[PDB]
Design an enzyme around this catalytic site. Structure first.
Site, PDB file in Angstrom:
ATOM      1  N   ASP A  29     -18.988 -10.067 -41.798  1.00 50.21           N
ATOM      2  CA  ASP A  29     -18.413  -9.685 -40.507  1.00 50.21           C
ATOM      3  C   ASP A  29     -19.432  -9.797 -39.386  1.00 50.21           C
ATOM      4  O   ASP A  29     -20.279  -8.894 -39.211  1.00 50.21           O
ATOM      5  CB  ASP A  29     -17.889  -8.236 -40.600  1.00 50.21           C
ATOM      6  N   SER A  34     -17.109 -19.349 -23.310  1.00 49.79           N
ATOM      7  CA  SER A  34     -16.429 -20.628 -23.460  1.00 49.79           C
ATOM      8  C   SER A  34     -16.198 -21.247 -22.090  1.00 49.79           C
ATOM      9  O   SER A  34     -16.012 -20.542 -21.109  1.00 49.79           O
ATOM     10  CB  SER A  34     -15.094 -20.427 -24.180  1.00 49.79           C
TER      11      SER A  34
END
Length: 330
Positions: A35, A199
């Site tokens: 994770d 992004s």
């Protein structure tokens, strides 16, 4: 040193991925959810409330000759999906794919919430976010990656998750045969303890690319892709019959649909998520309403590039003094 381990989807939908981990002496092998959005290594154990164990493999520290109780230490964590666990702490030897750390904090669960009990395939979590998020008190502990880093050939790990198929986590090296083209690297902020990056935009299907900054986290521990409501609405508008359902808790779409792809930007590069990756199947057994793999982050407070996005790429988690993230197509 290096390590290399295969990671396997827990079910037919890729709801999560499990990776075998060796703990203790002699080894006790448990299947953990790696994770990159949390920083605790915790396991079902011989200390876990009996009624809260249902089919998981447990760690029994009394059978490990290298286990030592970390006196006074406790831990308690909550995840974004509403689940939680807590307990006490041992140190022991932990190996992943041939890479060994001695003195690793292994957090032993005394209590787990219902969705952990109900997930028989997940024996615990192995956190790979930054150690500043580790919940052990009163002495915070280091992640497996942080403990291994100095010994690694290069201070990196990579995530290569499969679509409906096994993949690989590598530690300490970049497998240049595992991706196509080049790796595009992008800046990371560690201010929130996550692999947080920006992004450069998105496209829906064969549509034009929209240049726009989207701050979010690379999180292997989250199943879906959570993005701003504007972006998500633009995606699902291209699917006839798709709608946000309050009662279901997100966007659903007719199971008869063919989904469009979704592209996200990494600098000047582009990662394409095929439409099929975005289908999470019937909302309930036998339903013709299917759950979407792209959902709104409104109310989460952060955008999350979860497995739906990451499995479309070869992803480098670069833990150099100034961390960065790399993405390649594959």
């Amino acid at each position: 040193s290096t390590g290399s381990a295969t990671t396997t989807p827990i079910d037919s939908l890729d709801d999560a991925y499990i990776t075998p981990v060796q703990i203790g002496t002699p080894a006790q092998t448990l299947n953990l959810d790696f994770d990159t959005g949390s920083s605790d290594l915790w396991v079902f154990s011989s200390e876990t409330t009996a009624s809260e164990v249902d089919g998981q493999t447990i760690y029994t520290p009394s059978k490990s000759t290298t286990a030592k109780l970390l006196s006074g230490a406790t831990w308690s964590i909550s995840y974004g999906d509403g689940s939680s666990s807590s307990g006490d702490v041992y140190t022991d030897t932990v190996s992943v794919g041939g890479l060994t750390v001695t003195g690793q904090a292994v957090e032993s669960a005394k209590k787990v919430s219902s969705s952990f009990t109900e997930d028989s395939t997940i024996d615990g979590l192995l956190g790979l976010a930054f150690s500043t998020l580790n919940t052990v008190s009163p002495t915070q502990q280091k992640t497996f990656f942080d403990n291994a880093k100095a010994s690694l050939d290069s201070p990196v790990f990579t995530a290569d998750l499969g679509y409906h198929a096994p993949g690989t986590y590598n530690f300490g090296f970049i497998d240049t045969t595992a991706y196509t083209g080049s790796i595009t690297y992008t800046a990371v902020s560690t201010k929130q303890g996550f692999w947080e990056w920006t992004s450069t935009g998105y496209a829906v299907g064969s549509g034009t690319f929209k240049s726009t900054s989207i701050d979010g986290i690379a999180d292997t521990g989250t199943t879906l892709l959570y993005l701003p409501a504007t972006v998500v609405s633009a995606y699902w508008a291209q699917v006839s019959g798709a709608k946000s359902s309050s009662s279901v808790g997100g966007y659903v779409f007719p199971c008869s649909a063919t989904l469009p792809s979704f592209t996200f930007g990494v600098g000047s590069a582009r990662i394409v998520i095929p439409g099929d990756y975005i289908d999470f199947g019937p909302i309930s057994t036998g339903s013709s309403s299917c759950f979407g793999g792209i959902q709104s982050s409104a109310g989460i407070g952060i955008n999350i590039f979860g497995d739906v996005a990451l499995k479309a790429a070869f992803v480098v988690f670069n833990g150099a003094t100034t961390p960065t993230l790399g993405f390649a197509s594959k």
